[PDB]
Amino acid sequence: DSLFAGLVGEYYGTNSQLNNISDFRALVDSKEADATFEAANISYGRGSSDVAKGTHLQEFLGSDASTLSTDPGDNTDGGIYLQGYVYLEAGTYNFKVTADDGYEITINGNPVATVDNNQSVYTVTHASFTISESGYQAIDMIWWDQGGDYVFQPTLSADGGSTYFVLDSAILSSTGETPYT
Numbered sequence: 772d773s774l775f776a777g778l779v780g781e782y783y784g785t786n787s788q789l790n791n792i793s794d795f796r797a798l799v800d801s802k803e804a805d806a807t808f809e810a811a812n813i814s815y816g817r818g819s820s821d822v823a824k825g826t827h828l829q830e831f832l833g834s835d836a837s838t839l840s841t842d843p844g845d846n847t848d849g850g851i852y853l854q855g856y857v858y859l860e861a862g863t864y865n866f867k868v869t870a871d872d873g874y875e876i877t878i879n880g881n882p883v884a885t886v887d888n889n890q891s892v893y894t895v896t897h898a899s900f901t902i903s904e905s906g907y908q909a910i911d912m913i914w915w916d917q918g919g920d921y922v923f924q925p926t927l928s929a930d931g932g933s934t935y936f937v938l939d940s941a942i943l944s945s946t947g948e949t950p951y952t
């Protein structure tokens with residue numbers, strides 16, 4: 772599998788409505804990804820006029836779009852599924868996520884940030900969680916756009932919410948091996 776400083780990204784589009792996490796996960800299950808990419812700087816958007824139309828996905832992904840495997844065709848609705856590893860020291864953390872529409876982030880298989888509905892842009896400060904052992908932790912994310920505006924910026928705090936960082940190539944690994952890229 773390729774080793775890079777990022778998460779493995781998949782994009783899926785649909786012409787059905789995405790109302791909630793279940794709907795997007797079912798879309799992921801239903802087919803092969805419409806495009807793959809390397810998610811090395813997970814701060815996407817904001818934009819307008821549907822993520823799944825035209826070149827809006829490219830604009831949304833920005834700095835990560837040069838790794839797209841293809842340019843998807845138009846759809847009404849769409850979203851991303853990211854998976855891989857993140858280096859975190861043992862301790863307490865919490866996410867603070869800005870998004871339109873919803874999303875779910877899991878670490879070591881456990882949900883740590885959830886918005887199970889559509890929404891115009893909103894920032895949630897999520898509850899803390901603990902990491903028991905320093906190292907590369909498993910992480911995955913889903914996010915979608917039902918239409919209209921779109922943005923997705925998870926940030927993470929290690930210091931009780933005083934400072935937050937974007938998850939990017941400093942700490943992400945596609946396989947859990949140390950990237951030297």
Ligand SMILES: O[C@H]1[C@H](O)[C@@H](O)[C@H](O)[C@@H](O)[C@H]1O
Nearest residue numbers: 871889890891892918919920
């Ligand atoms: O991007 C849109 C936009 O913000 C709409 O005004 C809101 O109602 C939707 O839920 C969201 O998807």
Ligand SMILES: [Ca+2]
Nearest residue numbers: 799800802803
């Ligand atoms: Ca699939």
Ligand SMILES: [Ca+2]
Nearest residue numbers: 825842843844
């Ligand atoms: Ca396109």
Ligand SMILES: [Ca+2]
Nearest residue numbers: 814816833834
């Ligand atoms: Ca950008």
Ligand SMILES: [Ca+2]
Nearest residue numbers: 889890891892
């Ligand atoms: Ca609203």
Ligand SMILES: [Ca+2]
Nearest residue numbers: 788848917918
């Ligand atoms: Ca829709």
Ligand SMILES: [Ca+2]
Nearest residue numbers: 917918919920
């Ligand atoms: Ca939207």
